[PDB]
Amino acid sequence: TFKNNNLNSGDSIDYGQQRRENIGDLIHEVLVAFEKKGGDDAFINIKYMVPTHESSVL
Amino acid sequence: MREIVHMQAGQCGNQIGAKFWEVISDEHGIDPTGTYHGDSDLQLERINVYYNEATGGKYVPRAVLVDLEPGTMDSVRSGPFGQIFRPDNFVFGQSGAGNNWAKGHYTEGAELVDSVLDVVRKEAESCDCLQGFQLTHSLGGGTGSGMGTLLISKIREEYPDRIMNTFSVVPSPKVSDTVVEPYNATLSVHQLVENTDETYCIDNEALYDICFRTLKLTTPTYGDLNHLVSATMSGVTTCLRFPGQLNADLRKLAVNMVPFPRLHFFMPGFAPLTSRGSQQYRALTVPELTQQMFDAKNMMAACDPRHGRYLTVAAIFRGRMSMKEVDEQMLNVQNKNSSYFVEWIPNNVKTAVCDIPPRGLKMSATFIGNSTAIQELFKRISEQFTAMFRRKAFLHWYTGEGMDEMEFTEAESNMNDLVSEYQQYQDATAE
Amino acid sequence: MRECISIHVGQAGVQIGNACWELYCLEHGIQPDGQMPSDKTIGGGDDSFNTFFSETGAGKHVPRAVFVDLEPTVVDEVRTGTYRQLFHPEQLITGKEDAANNYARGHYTIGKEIVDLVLDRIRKLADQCTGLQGFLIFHSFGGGTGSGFASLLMERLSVDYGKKSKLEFAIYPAPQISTAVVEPYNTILTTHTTLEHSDCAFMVDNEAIYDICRRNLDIERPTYTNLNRLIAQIVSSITASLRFDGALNVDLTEFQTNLVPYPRIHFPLATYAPVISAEKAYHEQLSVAEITNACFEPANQMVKCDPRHGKYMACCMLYRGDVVPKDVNAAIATIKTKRTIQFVDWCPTGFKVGINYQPPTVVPGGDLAKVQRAVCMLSNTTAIAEAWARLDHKFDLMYAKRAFVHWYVGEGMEEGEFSEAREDLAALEKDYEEVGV
Amino acid sequence: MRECISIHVGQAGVQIGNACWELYCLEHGIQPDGQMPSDKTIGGGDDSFNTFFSETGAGKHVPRAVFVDLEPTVVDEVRTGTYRQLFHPEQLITGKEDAANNYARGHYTIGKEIVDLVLDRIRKLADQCTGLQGFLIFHSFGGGTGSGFASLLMERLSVDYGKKSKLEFAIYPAPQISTAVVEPYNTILTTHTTLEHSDCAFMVDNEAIYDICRRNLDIERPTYTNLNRLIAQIVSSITASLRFDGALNVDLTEFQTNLVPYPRIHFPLATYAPVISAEKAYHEQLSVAEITNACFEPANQMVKCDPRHGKYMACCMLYRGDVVPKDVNAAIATIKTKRTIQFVDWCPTGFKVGINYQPPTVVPGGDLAKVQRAVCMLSNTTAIAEAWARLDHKFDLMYAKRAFVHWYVGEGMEEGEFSEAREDLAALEKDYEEVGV
Amino acid sequence: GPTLDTTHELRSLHPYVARSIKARDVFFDDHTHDAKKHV
Amino acid sequence: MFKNTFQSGFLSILYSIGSKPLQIWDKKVRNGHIKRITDNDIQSLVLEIVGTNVSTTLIECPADARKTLGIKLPFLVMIIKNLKKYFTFEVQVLDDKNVRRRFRASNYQSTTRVKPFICTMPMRLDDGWNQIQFNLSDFTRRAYGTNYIETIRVNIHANCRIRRVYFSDRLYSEDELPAEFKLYLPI
Amino acid sequence: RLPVGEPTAHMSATQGPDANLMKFYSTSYATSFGVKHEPFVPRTTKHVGTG
Amino acid sequence: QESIYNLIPQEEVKQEKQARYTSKFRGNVKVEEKTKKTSSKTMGP
Amino acid sequence: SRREVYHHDPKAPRDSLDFILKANYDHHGELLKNRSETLMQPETLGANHGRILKNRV
Numbered sequence A: 001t002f003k004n005n006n007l008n009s010g011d012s013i014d015y016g017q018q019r020r021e022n023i024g025d026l027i028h029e030v031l032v033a034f035e036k037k038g039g040d041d042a043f044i045n046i047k048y049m050v051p052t053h054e055s056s057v058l
Numbered sequence B: 001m002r003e004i005v006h007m008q009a010g011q012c013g014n015q016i017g018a019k020f021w022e023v024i025s026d027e028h029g030i031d032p033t034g035t036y037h038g039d040s041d042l043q044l045e046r047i048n049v050y051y052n053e054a055t056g057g058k059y060v061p062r063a064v065l066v067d068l069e070p071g072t073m074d075s076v077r078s079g080p081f082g083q084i085f086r087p088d089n090f091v092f093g094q095s096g097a098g099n100n101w102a103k104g105h106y107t108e109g110a111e112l113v114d115s116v117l118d119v120v121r122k123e124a125e126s127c128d129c130l131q132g133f134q135l136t137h138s139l140g141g142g143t144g145s146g147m148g149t150l151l152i153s154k155i156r157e158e159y160p161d162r163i164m165n166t167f168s169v170v171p172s173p174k175v176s177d178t179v180v181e182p183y184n185a186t187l188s189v190h191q192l193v194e195n196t197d198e199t200y201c202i203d204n205e206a207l208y209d210i211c212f213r214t215l216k217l218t219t220p221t222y223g224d225l226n227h228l229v230s231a232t233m234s235g236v237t238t239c240l241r242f243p244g245q246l247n248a249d250l251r252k253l254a255v256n257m258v259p260f261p262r263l264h265f266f267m268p269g270f271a272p273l274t275s276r277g278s279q280q281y282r283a284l285t286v287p288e289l290t291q292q293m294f295d296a297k298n299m300m301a302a303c304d305p306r307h308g309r310y311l312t313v314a315a316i317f318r319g320r321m322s323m324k325e326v327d328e329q330m331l332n333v334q335n336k337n338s339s340y341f342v343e344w345i346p347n348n349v350k351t352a353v354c355d356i357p358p359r360g361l362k363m364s365a366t367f368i369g370n371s372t373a374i375q376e377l378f379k380r381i382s383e384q385f386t387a388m389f390r391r392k393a394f395l396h397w398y399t400g401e402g403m404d405e406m407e408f409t410e411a412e413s414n415m416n417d418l419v420s421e422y423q424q425y426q427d428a429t430a431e
Numbered sequence C, D: 001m002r003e004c005i006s007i008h009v010g011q012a013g014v015q016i017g018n019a020c021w022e023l024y025c026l027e028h029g030i031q032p033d034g035q036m037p038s039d040k041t042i043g044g045g046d047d048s049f050n051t052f053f054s055e056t057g058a059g060k061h062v063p064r065a066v067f068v069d070l071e072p073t074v075v076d077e078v079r080t081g082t083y084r085q086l087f088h089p090e091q092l093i094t095g096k097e098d099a100a101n102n103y104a105r106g107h108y109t110i111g112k113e114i115v116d117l118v119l120d121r122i123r124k125l126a127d128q129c130t131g132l133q134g135f136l137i138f139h140s141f142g143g144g145t146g147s148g149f150a151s152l153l154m155e156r157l158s159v160d161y162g163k164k165s166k167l168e169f170a171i172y173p174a175p176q177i178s179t180a181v182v183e184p185y186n187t188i189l190t191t192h193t194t195l196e197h198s199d200c201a202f203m204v205d206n207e208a209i210y211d212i213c214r215r216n217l218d219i220e221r222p223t224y225t226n227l228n229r230l231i232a233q234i235v236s237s238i239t240a241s242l243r244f245d246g247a248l249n250v251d252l253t254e255f256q257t258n259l260v261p262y263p264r265i266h267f268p269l270a271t272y273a274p275v276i277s278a279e280k281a282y283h284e285q286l287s288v289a290e291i292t293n294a295c296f297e298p299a300n301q302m303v304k305c306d307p308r309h310g311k312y313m314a315c316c317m318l319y320r321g322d323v324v325p326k327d328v329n330a331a332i333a334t335i336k337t338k339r340t341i342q343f344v345d346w347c348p349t350g351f352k353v354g355i356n357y358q359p360p361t362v363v364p365g366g367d368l369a370k371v372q373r374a375v376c377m378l379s380n381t382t383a384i385a386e387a388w389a390r391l392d393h394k395f396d397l398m399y400a401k402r403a404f405v406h407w408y409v410g411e412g413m414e415e416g417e418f419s420e421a422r423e424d425l426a427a428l429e430k431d432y433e434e435v436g437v
Numbered sequence E: 001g002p003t004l005d006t007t008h009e010l011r012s013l014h015p016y017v018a019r020s021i022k023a024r025d026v027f028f029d030d031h032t033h034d035a036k037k038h039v
Numbered sequence F: 001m002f003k004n005t006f007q008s009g010f011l012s013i014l015y016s017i018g019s020k021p022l023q024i025w026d027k028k029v030r031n032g033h034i035k036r037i038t039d040n041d042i043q044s045l046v047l048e049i050v051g052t053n054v055s056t057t058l059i060e061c062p063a064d065a066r067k068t069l070g071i072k073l074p075f076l077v078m079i080i081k082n083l084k085k086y087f088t089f090e091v092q093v094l095d096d097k098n099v100r101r102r103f104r105a106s107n108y109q110s111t112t113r114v115k116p117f118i119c120t121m122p123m124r125l126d127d128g129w130n131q132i133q134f135n136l137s138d139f140t141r142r143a144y145g146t147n148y149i150e151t152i153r154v155n156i157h158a159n160c161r162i163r164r165v166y167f168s169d170r171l172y173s174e175d176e177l178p179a180e181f182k183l184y185l186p187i
Numbered sequence G: 001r002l003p004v005g006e007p008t009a010h011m012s013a014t015q016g017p018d019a020n021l022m023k024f025y026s027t028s029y030a031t032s033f034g035v036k037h038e039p040f041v042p043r044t045t046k047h048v049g050t051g
Numbered sequence H: 001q002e003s004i005y006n007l008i009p010q011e012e013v014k015q016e017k018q019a020r021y022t023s024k025f026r027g028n029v030k031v032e033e034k035t036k037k038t039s040s041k042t043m044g045p
Numbered sequence I: 001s002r003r004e005v006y007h008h009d010p011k012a013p014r015d016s017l018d019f020i021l022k023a024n025y026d027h028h029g030e031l032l033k034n035r036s037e038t039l040m041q042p043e044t045l046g047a048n049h050g051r052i053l054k055n056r057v
Ligand SMILES: Nc1nc2c(ncn2[C@@H]2O[C@H](COP(=O)(O)OP(=O)(O)OP(=O)(O)O)[C@@H](O)[C@H]2O)c(=O)[nH]1
Pocket: B245, B246, C009, C010, C011, C012, C013, C015, C016, C070, C071, C098, C099, C100, C101, C102, C140, C141, C142, C143, C144, C145, C146, C147, C171, C178, C179, C180, C206, C224, C225, C227, C228
């Protein structure tokens, strides 16, 4: 639901990129950490839940 | 291919429209089962105007039936030519207005106008051209007047450009037929002025004398009364359904009569009228047909155009005849009775001619008049309204049904203003 | 190559087109299916049909006509019955809702949905021609489509074409006879477009043709059919010089150059006047001088106006049949020596004579006699000012009290066009009264 | 001598080919069972039906067609219909499980188990023919077998045969009318895998044929039978030069060397004229200039795309009937002297014409008329780029959140194939605007 | 309801009405499956 | 644009360190986001073009159409980060003739398929911070047989973290690069 | 919604009115234009010519 | 060109009306529209 | 004045093909409409065409 809720600021510095309050960013490395420290049958389940995601280990 | 939708409201509207569908099914060859058994193809040639086509040969009417009680529609369904109507077009309630305009317009007709509007919207989107609407009701009843005027208001809100016709069975000067007729008529005319495109004020007493003197007939019966009314409607509408040398539809009729927007109250007239046993002495000519039109005793309202002044006259000759006889008779009747004609409208008669006379008739002729004499009807209604409203007769019903007295005062003011403009255009001169 | 396209607008135009294309089909020997009758091939290279009819395939002729209405019937009546296969299905164009005797409906609301379609049909029929003589528009002033939509068509035709000649035949309201009440309003509103989108304006009064039918043809209750047959006879006599070969004869440009003195004065009067029944034709000297005098009589005009109250500017006399030029010159001499007929001082030679070899043909079930000599006089005079004055008095009488204006204003035209058209007709009246003296 | 092989893939292709072979049998005088009539003789003389048929000895004609669909029914109505005896049983190839509106299921599944069988049948037909001219592959871009197995078969044919013309009739999905929800995905993928294997990709659109049938051909209720009859008329006009003698003989090789400027633009829109109905038909002249103008009208285009928002690259005008090449030259000059019709600045010679002497044959029970002249347009233009823009908008809306992609992934296709196809068709749009500028 | 024939239906009614049905809807007697129909 | 300027050593077009380093580029975003953030690997400002459906989110090198980035330098070097996602870029060049070809290199193609106006080539870049070097002269000599004249436009589509895009004449290996052009990775 | 300027199917697939005056359903157009041609059967043609 | 004196408001003075002509058969029309009319001959009073 | 030989009008098409081509119908996105409105004219719309249609100012 909240995967694509990132900041479309254009060419503008995100000065709040130290408190880490961007859900659209945070979900991405949550999924990357899941796929990395998951297993062989992890991309199929993650792709089954969220259809946009694609593998970081391929 | 120009379709019009027919609505009937109240007892009078239901019986009159039932007779109307009976006669216009007879002239189109539609049997009571709903199929077609006509002689020539001209009967079904323009059948799309009044009938929708079902699967097979079924031709259902383009009609909506409204009454707050099953009642009169129950009688119509259990009468002849009652099986042609779709059962989904019978919209009815449970209570029934007790000749109460407030009940028919605010309390009982309020929670039925949604169903009637859905039926009307469906049956009108089933059309292809949708020339307009015609409604049969009386200005002397509860659901005839209040629910009918509510329907007119909502339909003008929905479709603001279509032609609206009302057939407006007005209260009679003699007898009563209802004791709250001044209230009902004053409240309904106030809606009819600002929401109807053309209105044929029809009087029971005038129809009584027409049916009993010019037709003898002894016992007249509402079958023949409503059939005279239905014959006038057929003569009005016929240029949609049959070809002619000079055709004229509802919009031509309304443009060529109505001079100013709040002057669309007419007097109808059907003028082949032969008493029993005088057809042998009848000559059956165009001058005699026009003379039977332009006779004051042949009007279907109590008002006297000889007392008043004609503004616009529409004559539709439905049958085969000559432009010679027709045009010269209109010119002669105008030039002889130039006293009963406004001088500021030169040759204030529209002429239409069809080609198909009634079955069993050689020629027919419908008469519509827009004289200033019709102010007498509103004067009668307004004076009876004053006599009741001064002593607050029967007003506790209208006030207890959630409706105030300033509605009555505004309705009376509008009717008196209508009489004022009618008298102004009567006595206004050319130069 | 002398084709001219006929447009028939309104109920009056459509009925006149029926009575006119009947006459054309019998004059060219064509059955009401496009084809010639059985074993009645044309032969002899007769190219007379190649002005009103077009070869499509294997001896079929389509008319060069566009029948327009805004409503069904009449056009539907001729689409279904007798002359069913004669016309192309896409040239009898009809609408759904009529213009309701309203110039505003005919010009602004219902007019702008079918005008492009009939213009495209006109363009296709013009492309089918190898050089077009002009257009013949037929309408009544009357109400609705005959005024508003005819105004729209003339307004677009004058900017599309304009090297061609547009002759329009208008059924003018009578002095007292009328089948409507807004005829003065519609006729006033269409005066401007008939002033500035037409080249010749042949105009007819229903009451005058009624009187001619009652007096000459001896029929006592005429319908529209006899009047439309007389209009068809007039138009046939006008275009018979283009159709058939003969003696010295005029064209649609020879006529205009010899008729109209000024661009604003283009409102002549048409009188086809060997009009009689056969029973009285047994007892008449049907001679050239007699029929010329019958044309010049004030009681044989198709507009209820007295030409003795005006001065003749020019007259184009179209003769048909066994007609030599010398008795035509004798008739012109007698007309000149007549003192009742007066001519304007700046037009001394006021006659243009065109003689054609083909006599007119009677339709079966008609009322005209089969005469061997026919004459149509097309005369520009100042007597049409009486019709203008009658129209203006009726319009002023209605417009003083602001009657029926709400229909036009609600349907879309602004208030000022009424006064603008009244001023236009006042200017035309001033022009005619100035040029008369 | 010259021979063509027609492959009808999908339900749309099979029904199209049914109409096409019915028309071919009617115009070559072959009865539906396969024999010629005994008492009647229609074939022979002006015929080269050996380009589309095979003579098996005793007198039966077998068409060179392969009807393929991966679902039994639509092949069994051919197998049990009126034309049951016409087709050899191994020509009508059917599958077991449907492609299910899935490019992945038509490309990487069940069709992979029948591509060998259809290739063997194609090999047998090519061994039978005495010199192959090309293939006519009829299908739709909508989805399933038409977008899937058809593309796979074209790739296999390009690998196996090579250097032969593969003309492709594509039923392109309409801009708004559609009978499926994965049509953008299927059309994107089949365009990507057909763009390098189709020499020509003649585009036909159902909604535009609906427009044609409603306006020109009367018919208030158009259907797939009428659509297939019109497409059969188009392909008969295309292939009539292989079967009848003509002044300008145009075979299947010319369509790729005169309509494909660069090896990416091979999508010419089809247009047929006259498409007049039998009611009007003989009420019009239907001349060469008339049919060419009606062919050049933007409303009479059989792909829902007006040519006024683009410049014409090339135009193949296949004239048929009593057409004279001087008349064709005059018509083409008349269009070339119009400024609203724009041609690209690099192509002064924008027309290739083919004149054929045999008029088209009316189908009994059909809706067209028996006409002499008929022009068929194959117009390559810079206008279908807006259709590609709309279709990439549809693909973008679908693929923004990966709707329906799980089916394509689960039956074989990789995830990146969709993006490859989108990238290549965006490059095709860039190619169109680069050529147009 | 009963099994539809529709040939008897538009044969038992008036010729003008049946002509109108055939003119406006060509599917009232759509008989593609009639030779393969086996009465 | 970029004509009548000295183009000898290097020509930088995008550089995420700056006030407005997208002034000449054209921002088209449909289902993604462009933003400047501080990367955790080089500890400096980096532009990001992350977005699904990579064919829509993209930036052209000219701000508008009908204008050409006239650059005569052959080599194109881009400092890009690997996000293990679909990366795509395109360059339009002018040949010896008047024709303009397009080289489109993407990380999800598999076959180099030469076409008349487009090359459609694949690439397989490593993990972390890659430096894409793209010759254009050998490439236009090998794909069409012409010679490189000038560039027209540069598109970098999506799913990338850009540090610097520039042009150079020769290869310009690591130890002769200037300090600001080096890709420096602190510990 | 039927098109504006075209004949309708119900209008087209009809019989004409009687041209006999002694018939009841006789129009003025029928009785005036076609009273001579009451049992009229129109004859359809075809185009001729070939390449 | 342009000048200071071009900034003077010159207005438009006055545009005439040029009233209608009212043709000479007006009296004849007024006479002939009433030479035949009577008062209540057919309907009666 | 239009019949006068010093008045040539560059509009007013000589051909029916140009007559439909100067219309407003957009074949890519106008849904299933008819011959009456597939050839609608800008003069009928009331656009800013440089054609004098009436003498009225
Ligand atoms: N001579 C002649 N005049 C006719 C005929 N039909 C109608 N008219 C004239 O036309 C007038 C009636 O108005 P129409 O012309 O019918 O109106 P329209 O042109 O059909 O347009 P609408 O208002 O929509 O009916 C009458 O006053 C007649 O003078 C005809 O058949 N013959």
